[PDB]
Design a protein around this motif. Structure first.
Motif: not given
Ligand SMILES: *[C@@H]1O[C@H](CO)[C@@H](O[C@@H]2O[C@H](CO)[C@@H](O[C@@H]3O[C@H](CO[C@H]4O[C@H](CO)[C@@H](O)[C@H](O[C@H]5O[C@H](CO)[C@@H](O)[C@H](O)[C@@H]5O)[C@@H]4O)[C@@H](O)[C@H](O[C@H]4O[C@H](CO)[C@@H](O)[C@H](O)[C@@H]4O)[C@@H]3O)[C@H](O)[C@H]2NC(C)=O)[C@H](O)[C@H]1NC(C)=O
Ligand SMILES: *[C@@H]1O[C@H](CO)[C@@H](O[C@@H]2O[C@H](CO)[C@@H](O[C@@H]3O[C@H](CO)[C@@H](O)[C@H](O)[C@@H]3O)[C@H](O)[C@H]2NC(C)=O)[C@H](O)[C@H]1NC(C)=O
Ligand SMILES: *[C@@H]1O[C@H](CO)[C@@H](O[C@@H]2O[C@H](CO)[C@@H](O[C@@H]3O[C@H](CO)[C@@H](O)[C@H](O)[C@@H]3O)[C@H](O)[C@H]2NC(C)=O)[C@H](O)[C@H]1NC(C)=O
Ligand SMILES: *[C@@H]1O[C@H](CO)[C@@H](O[C@@H]2O[C@H](CO)[C@@H](O[C@@H]3O[C@H](CO)[C@@H](O)[C@H](O)[C@@H]3O)[C@H](O)[C@H]2NC(C)=O)[C@H](O)[C@H]1NC(C)=O
Ligand SMILES: *[C@@H]1O[C@H](CO)[C@@H](O[C@@H]2O[C@H](CO)[C@@H](O[C@@H]3O[C@H](CO)[C@@H](O)[C@H](O)[C@@H]3O)[C@H](O)[C@H]2NC(C)=O)[C@H](O)[C@H]1NC(C)=O
Ligand SMILES: *[C@@H]1O[C@H](CO)[C@@H](O[C@@H]2O[C@H](CO)[C@@H](O)[C@H](O)[C@H]2NC(C)=O)[C@H](O)[C@H]1NC(C)=O
Ligand SMILES: *[C@@H]1O[C@H](CO)[C@@H](O[C@@H]2O[C@H](CO)[C@@H](O)[C@H](O)[C@H]2NC(C)=O)[C@H](O)[C@H]1NC(C)=O
Ligand SMILES: *[C@@H]1O[C@H](CO)[C@@H](O[C@@H]2O[C@H](CO)[C@@H](O)[C@H](O)[C@H]2NC(C)=O)[C@H](O)[C@H]1NC(C)=O
Ligand SMILES: *[C@@H]1O[C@H](CO)[C@@H](O[C@@H]2O[C@H](CO)[C@@H](O)[C@H](O)[C@H]2NC(C)=O)[C@H](O)[C@H]1NC(C)=O
Ligand SMILES: *[C@@H]1O[C@H](CO)[C@@H](O)[C@H](O)[C@H]1NC(C)=O
Ligand SMILES: *[C@@H]1O[C@H](CO)[C@@H](O)[C@H](O)[C@H]1NC(C)=O
Ligand SMILES: *[C@@H]1O[C@H](CO)[C@@H](O)[C@H](O)[C@H]1NC(C)=O
Ligand SMILES: *[C@@H]1O[C@H](CO)[C@@H](O)[C@H](O)[C@H]1NC(C)=O
Ligand SMILES: *[C@@H]1O[C@H](CO)[C@@H](O)[C@H](O)[C@H]1NC(C)=O
Ligand SMILES: *[C@@H]1O[C@H](CO)[C@@H](O)[C@H](O)[C@H]1NC(C)=O
Ligand SMILES: *[C@@H]1O[C@H](CO)[C@@H](O)[C@H](O)[C@H]1NC(C)=O
Ligand SMILES: *[C@@H]1O[C@H](CO)[C@@H](O)[C@H](O)[C@H]1NC(C)=O
Ligand SMILES: *[C@@H]1O[C@H](CO)[C@@H](O)[C@H](O)[C@H]1NC(C)=O
Ligand SMILES: *[C@@H]1O[C@H](CO)[C@@H](O)[C@H](O)[C@H]1NC(C)=O
Ligand SMILES: *[C@@H]1O[C@H](CO)[C@@H](O)[C@H](O)[C@H]1NC(C)=O
Ligand SMILES: *[C@@H]1O[C@H](CO)[C@@H](O)[C@H](O)[C@H]1NC(C)=O
Ligand SMILES: *[C@@H]1O[C@H](CO)[C@@H](O)[C@H](O)[C@H]1NC(C)=O
Ligand SMILES: *[C@@H]1O[C@H](CO)[C@@H](O)[C@H](O)[C@H]1NC(C)=O
Ligand SMILES: *[C@@H]1O[C@H](CO)[C@@H](O)[C@H](O)[C@H]1NC(C)=O
Ligand SMILES: *[C@@H]1O[C@H](CO)[C@@H](O)[C@H](O)[C@H]1NC(C)=O
Lengths: 128, 423, 120, 120, 423, 120
Positions: E1-7, E411-423, F63-71
């Motif tokens: 499970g991959l989730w958005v992580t903000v950098y 541009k400082p905002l980095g958006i990429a998926p990781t295996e972490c999840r908030r809470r 965050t709390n948003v799953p990765w949409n694999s279409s991205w």
């Protein structure tokens, strides 16, 4: 605040169909349902129906389902939170059983589980 | 148990005065808004404020008082580098070509000691007869004259007035709005619509139109000194032209100072004027009459301007690059097919934004001038029931377009009790 | 950008907040700059206050101050289901600065409580 | 507004910090604006640093850096009960930037530790 | 499970155009950068971007177009308070001292009605013969003349162009960089190096040097109208001087208006010129010849400037405070020890930054003028293979020094998926 | 100050982010001021967004948003060990605003979940 002044206490005989007015003030006429409730002398106080001065949605009792015409014209803005609306209601196959004082009352709140509850009442209109 | 809960970003706003900035569409060379302004978002985003009413007052608005000063601050910066006609305030030996004159004058040349004898055409209005056919420029006895840099143009293009971030613009959309008081159906916009700075008098040119009816607007209609502003739904099309094929003539007056004068009239000598359709103007004027009876239950009347300065008595405006002054007597004489024609004159020494002593020379536009414009409103004035037209102030022109808009602060801090408690 | 979230200005307080559904130095050069400074002066007017209450990065931060019923003796159901943020603000506008000061001391003392807690 | 909290400048460090008790373009038009920009440049000088140490919205944030006794070999009781913030600053002013860098790496690594922790 | 992580703070940058500000070293009185600029950090910090390549384009850079306007906006503000020579545009009764002239003129005095008869020396170039040895200043027939406040100096000092916070400057360091396209080994700097605003023509004076080879730079070498910019590794030392021991003479022309004229020639009458070593210039010019054969596989040629205005045909520059104009025919005549000497003239009425009609009078520098400068480049132009020198525009001078630098957003905002999840 | 952290622009994404190793009103007076305002307009462009995602004071916020694999249907090992932040940005640049909006609603709802949690 707010005050719902009703129509006049004029009388008619069976077979007719009378309209009762309800002129509001001091509150936003669109924010709360208008509610008419009849107090027949030979029965218990009977709830007739509320309409939405905003949504235009009505809801009557099954005892007045095909017998009552309830309407409202648009409100006149007075200030940011004050309007002046008018509420109208009629009865179809009217008889003498429908004799009694008719009231109009605005709703309680505008959200939650007690939204339309007849909070602020009018002056009543004697029929007969 | 209820406790304070802080909310950041609550739908609540105040009423303050901020500095608006200008946005512009995709087009350069005009005094209004050159490359100075940011590009307008091709989709002006407007979200509707449901369940909202607001108290507008177009007559105590600050976008108007800020626009009136913005426009005036624009010409002052564009006339700052241009050329002075202070050496031209000499004696003029004039003769008729008394509508326009062929005038001769002794002029300084490229050298400071040599004098030249030049001739130039001058409109009669831009000249005064001093105490043997010797004349003098009209505004040398009280003001400094500055010639427009002959490249900048006064073509009115849409101006987008935007509010800063953390502020908002509230727009009324009741198509009957008096201009004052509670308006419902309000919506917020980041920027106003495109607004053209059309500077006219008596008749409002190239303005917006009422969607229904014709909305009369003023503060107090019970006295008389308050300017009535008519809005219209039917626009009468006016057509103006100065037919004298004119020539531009560069004159040498000093080092790098080539003032541009009225050269010669090629062709016929004719008269500038404007045309309006008789049936159409009489129709839509017998319409404004119908709406004045609502508030004044008497018989309305149109006479003509009471008199005074030339600019107030006339339908002054701009056309092609030269400033017209039209006698509107044949428009306002209330008598409940053909065409009507207004005799117009033209000045070159004009003094817009009535400053202390700053005149303005418009260099002559060569050739045939013709502009057709829409009359979308009026500005009447009532006698102490007769209505003679007249301009109270130039900010009246901006009011008739900014009546919808109203600038507001926004307050994000929301304080209210809830059943929660930290930790 | 999207600081105009007024979209629910006529809705009830609980329906809106609880559950959403290169210049040139001229008169457009100095005008457009002051409008740019005047915007972020005010964004830092509030984000500083939000930092002085332990609410940085929070839209809904709960506090440690009980509700003084003299501010408003009205029920949750006659606030968040009857009033709108525009008119509630006006009703409670007089005590708005007393609550600010009091929020500030609740967070300052909370900063030293955790200081005594993390010392162990 | 009230950025002048110097009221306890002559008090001991522990008595003060631990337990409190429309312009016109002329020379007042460009003066008043630069004074408005010069204020928020410096508020963001520090609030950015406070964000780089994991201290956003905190007046008293505890860190993860042990005290190097070469900075100051003095006791808690001869600091927070004897010295004042004005003179303590001067005594430790030389190492003030070494601690900043070191605070910055302690928070950056702490950001990835919780990243490895929330990955489970 | 991959989730958005903000950098926050990611090594990624865009390409935008910002306003650069000036930093200066430890020194006052020059038009370029007075006390206006912040002090330069004595250690310009440069960190190397490992594993990075970037696409530079010195010909579509914005630091150049911003510097070209910055320099022009500098003189305009420094010439704003100075004195006008508009009263000096009188008639001149001249005689030879035809290289320079001894001219008399009637001049206004401290009083407005009294006239004085003054004499002053004038270079022949700054004067035109009007339609009995009566003359006239060259730029009174089309421009306004402004004399330099005789205290400010045009001494070129290093300018440090810095980017604002949240922006960056990328520097190429491949010592063969064409000026365009992918450069590796790139490094970022907060500020550029010290850049001297040396305004010259044909020959680039006091510039930077190529570390290896001699780098030819242009956009399209296939047409001809694109200006070729030669860089050099060996600098030929030029030596210029105006030997006429001159005298400054203050003249009274008006209240507080003391214009400074060419007084008298003490000593011999001689000729201004420049010297270059024959073997050295011929050596390093037979070097640029070797590099043009790479792209054009023909035989290269040097003729002389095709003609036109004086500034384009000549090697115009500044020296001691007076503006030279050197005939470069003895430099460019390709013929595959001694010394060469270029005949130079001197103007006082010059018009840099070719405005609409703004002239500039340089007050005469008294005494013996001698400046030695390094020629570090060229700017050739190819015929439709001959190469005659010429200046396409003054921004060519800024390009030859800003080719390394390139401004970028970060541009400082980095958006990429990781295996972490908030809470 | 040190906003130029581009030092690892050519390194892999996981090697860089996961484990580091008084004016005068003239043309340098108004130039130097606009460069000072243009810098903090943009620092607040991002620090406001970081506040709208529950990321104030955080360099690495989960965050709390799953990765949409279409991205991007690519593996962790072919991102953080193969690509660089410069080119990953370009590949995912089209959906960059969809994720922003979606981050914003995940934090707003998370603000009211803790509001319902702290009400007990
Ligand atoms: C602007 O201002 C107006 C005026 O206040 C707002 O309108 C009011 O909104 C509130 C909610 O915020 C309404 O309260 C709800 O009322 C419904 C009753 O309607 C239901 O029953 C009808 C009769 O059976 C039925 O026809 C409806 O179904 C459709 O029909 C209408 C139009 O015909 C349409 O509007 C509906 O949306 C449907 O499409 C409808 O089902 C009641 O069911 C609600 O109770 C539920 O929800 C509450 C929380 O809201 C919850 O607490 C309850 O337990 C229950 O789960 C709720 O009471 C009110 O009736 C509206 N009208 C008034 C007050 O006159 C409007 O919302 C404002 N908009 C904005 C954007 O600010
Ligand atoms: C305005 O007045 C000026 C004088 O103040 C007029 O200038 C004069 O114009 C006439 C006709 O163009 C010139 O006379 C002509 O001379 C030429 C050449 O000899 C010849 O072709 C004609 O037959 C006629 O003789 C006259 O010289 C000229 N004066 C000067 C000083 O130039 C001007 O024409 C008037 N124009 C208007 C529109 O009123
Ligand atoms: C009200 O709006 C109308 C319509 O825009 C204006 O008419 C416009 O007038 C301008 C100026 O005279 C015209 O510009 C001219 O264009 C012609 C042909 O393009 C050109 O030959 C001229 O040199 C000049 O550039 C413009 O064409 C014309 N617009 C249309 C659609 O015809 C009118 O002037 C406005 N009224 C006022 C008082 O501003
Ligand atoms: C440039 O031309 C001006 C005249 O336009 C020259 O000024 C004149 O210079 C001569 C020599 O300096 C003066 O004559 C001398 O008078 C003095 C005193 O009587 C005497 O010592 C000499 O024997 C000789 O007679 C002459 O008066 C003077 N004219 C004026 C009005 O001052 C000037 O010398 C010329 N300079 C150059 C460099 O060309
Ligand atoms: C290229 O760079 C050289 C070296 O800086 C420039 O030579 C410099 O020229 C200036 C102006 O003529 C000299 O200033 C003068 O200094 C002497 C003695 O210090 C003084 O007597 C004068 O009053 C004047 O202030 C400067 O000394 C001289 N530099 C050196 C090292 O000799 C040359 O002018 C530059 N070329 C261009 C086109 O800018
Ligand atoms: C309320 O105001 C809005 C304008 O802000 C009106 O909305 C427009 O109505 C027309 C008519 O169908 C639509 O074509 C537009 O798309 C609507 N605009 C938007 C932004 O939705 C609306 O008609 C007004 N309502 C009343 C009763 O006057
Ligand atoms: C003059 O009036 C006519 C009629 O109203 C204008 O024509 C309209 O122009 C608008 C411009 O936005 C168009 O969107 C409409 O489709 C046009 N409708 C009709 C019926 O013509 C004309 O644009 C006006 N011209 C000026 C310069 O104001
Ligand atoms: C990459 O570019 C840098 C310049 O930014 C060069 O680094 C310099 O190299 C010299 C040669 O030894 C050293 O004396 C300097 O100290 C270096 N500067 C820095 C900042 O480290 C480097 O040579 C270039 N590499 C290549 C292959 O061209
Ligand atoms: C003229 O050219 C000479 C030779 O290149 C320059 O001398 C160099 O100057 C730099 C200046 O930073 C010194 O760092 C070098 O050590 C010098 N090297 C040599 C070999 O001379 C001289 O500075 C140049 N002068 C001008 C005004 O450009
Ligand atoms: C004015 O002009 C007329 C005709 O050109 C001439 O006869 C008269 O002498 C002139 N007078 C003066 C005072 O210039
Ligand atoms: C100009 O001056 C001369 C005298 O030098 C005179 O003859 C002529 O009439 C003058 N012209 C005007 C128009 O004043
Ligand atoms: C200026 O000239 C005008 C021309 O209309 C005249 O009426 C007025 O009396 C004059 N006033 C002054 C102060 O010169
Ligand atoms: C606009 O205002 C007028 C004022 O009398 C009112 O009659 C009309 O109903 C309003 N239009 C609306 C509310 O749509
Ligand atoms: C304008 O309309 C408002 C609507 O509320 C009304 O109250 C006011 O009396 C009107 N005034 C005039 C001058 O028409
Ligand atoms: C314009 O408004 C007037 C107002 O009285 C009305 O009579 C006329 O019919 C309207 N015309 C149109 C085309 O809407
Ligand atoms: C007003 O109307 C009529 C038309 O001539 C007349 O009584 C009067 O002269 C006009 N002008 C005025 C009163 O100034
Ligand atoms: C305007 O025209 C009328 C006739 O159309 C005329 O009687 C009147 O004098 C004129 N007024 C002006 C100022 O031109
Ligand atoms: C010009 O100067 C010469 C010599 O000084 C003199 O002879 C002549 O008369 C002068 N002429 C004029 C027009 O000043
Ligand atoms: C200056 O004017 C006088 C006449 O007052 C004349 O004698 C003299 O020759 C003039 N000189 C020049 C240089 O024009
Ligand atoms: C201005 O003077 C120059 C001198 O070289 C001359 O060539 C040109 O023709 C003149 N042009 C104008 C417009 O006066
Ligand atoms: C610089 O670029 C040239 C372009 O051909 C290339 O040959 C050279 O190897 C480069 N220098 C490097 C990569 O160090
Ligand atoms: C400049 O060098 C680049 C290096 O990539 C090359 O692609 C380009 O063709 C060259 N252009 C010229 C005009 O030399
Ligand atoms: C300078 O570059 C040229 C390029 O051809 C080369 O021949 C020469 O040897 C170089 N000289 C030095 C001193 O680097
Ligand atoms: C170019 O080179 C030679 C040298 O004199 C000759 O053919 C020609 O005259 C020169 N000048 C030109 C072509 O303008
Ligand atoms: C430049 O000098 C050459 C000879 O050295 C000469 O033939 C030519 O005419 C001169 N050109 C100019 C413009 O001085």
């Amino acid at each position: 605040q707010g005050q719902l002044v009703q129509s006049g206490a004029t009388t008619t005989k069976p077979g007719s169909s009378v309209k009762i007015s309800c002129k509001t003030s001091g509150y936003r006429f669109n924010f709360y349902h208008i509610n008419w409730i009849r107090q027949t002398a030979g029965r218990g106080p009977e709830w007739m129906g509320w309409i939405s001065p905003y949504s235009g949605d009505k809801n009557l009792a099954p005892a007045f389902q095909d017998r009552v015409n309830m309407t409202t014209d648009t409100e006149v803005p007075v200030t940011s939170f004050t309007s002046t609306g008018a509420a109208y209601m009629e009865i179809r196959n009217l008889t003498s059983d429908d004799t009694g004082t008719y009231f109009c009352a605005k709703g309680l709140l505008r959200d939650g589980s007690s939204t339309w509850l007849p909070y602020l009442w009018g002056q009543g209109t004697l029929l007969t | 148990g209820l406790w304070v809960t802080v909310y950041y970003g609550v739908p609540v706003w105040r009423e303050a005065k901020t500095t608006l900035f200008c946005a512009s569409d995709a087009k350069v060379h005009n005094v209004w808004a050159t490359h100075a302004c940011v590009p307008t978002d091709p989709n002006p985003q407007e979200l509707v404020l449901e369940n909202v009413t607001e108290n507008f007052n177009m007559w105590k608005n600050d976008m108007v008082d800020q626009m009136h000063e913005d426009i005036i601050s624009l010409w002052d910066q564009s006339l700052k580098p241009c050329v002075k006609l202070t050496p031209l305030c000499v004696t003029l030996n004039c003769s008729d070509a008394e509508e326009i004159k062929n005038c001769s004058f002794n002029a300084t040349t490229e050298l400071r000691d040599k004098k030249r004898r030049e001739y130039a055409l001058f409109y009669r209005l831009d000249i005064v007869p001093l105490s043997n056919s010797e004349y003098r420029l009209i505004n040398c006895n009280t003001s400094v004259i500055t010639q427009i840099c002959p490249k900048v143009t006064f073509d009115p293009i849409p101006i987008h007035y935007c509010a800063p971030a953390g502020y908002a613009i509230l727009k009324c959309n009741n198509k009957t709005f008096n201009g004052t008081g509670p308006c419902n159906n309000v919506s917020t916009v980041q920027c106003t619509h495109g607004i053209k700075p059309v500077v006219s008098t008596q008749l409002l040119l190239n303005g917006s139109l009422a969607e229904e009816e014709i909305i009369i607007r003023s503060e107090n209609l019970t006295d008389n000194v308050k300017t009535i502003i008519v809005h219209l739904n039917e626009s009468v099309e006016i057509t103006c032209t100065r037919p004298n094929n004119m020539t531009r003539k560069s004159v040498r007056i000093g080092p790098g100072q080539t003032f541009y004068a009225l050269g010669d009239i090629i062709g016929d000598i004719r008269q500038p004027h404007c045309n309006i359709s008789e049936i159409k103007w009489e129709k839509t004027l017998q319409r404004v009459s119908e709406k004045l009876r609502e508030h004044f239950n008497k018989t309305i009347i149109f006479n003509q301007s009471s008199g005074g300065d030339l600019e107030i008595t006339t339908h002054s405006f701009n056309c092609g690059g030269e400033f017209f002054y039209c006698n509107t007597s044949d428009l306002f004489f209330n008598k409940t097919n053909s065409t009507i024609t207004l005799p117009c004159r033209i000045k070159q020494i004009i003094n817009m934004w009535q400053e202390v002593g700053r005149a303005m020379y418009a260099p002559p536009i060569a050739g045939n001038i013709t502009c057709k414009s829409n009359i979308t409103g009026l500005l009447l004035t009532r006698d102490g029931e007769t209505f003679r037209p007249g301009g109270g102030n130039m900010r009246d022109n901006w009011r008739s377009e900014l009546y919808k808009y109203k600038v507001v602060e926004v307050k994000p801090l929301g304080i209210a009790p809830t059943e929660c408690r930290r930790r | 950008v999207f600081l105009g979230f007024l979209g629910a200005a006529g809705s009830t307080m609980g329906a809106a907040s609880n559950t959403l559904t290169m210049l040139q130095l001229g008169v457009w050069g100095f005008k457009q700059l002051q409008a740019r400074v005047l915007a972020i002066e005010r964004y830092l007017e509030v984000q500083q206050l939000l930092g002085m209450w332990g609410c940085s990065g929070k839209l809904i931060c709960c506090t440690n101050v009980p509700w003084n019923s003299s501010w408003s003796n009205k029920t949750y159901n006659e606030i968040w289901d009857n009033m709108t943020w525009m008119q509630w603000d006006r009703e409670i506008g007089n005590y708005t600065d007393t609550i600010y000061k009091l929020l500030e001391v609740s967070q300052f003392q909370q900063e030293i409580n955790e200081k005594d807690l993390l010392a162990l």
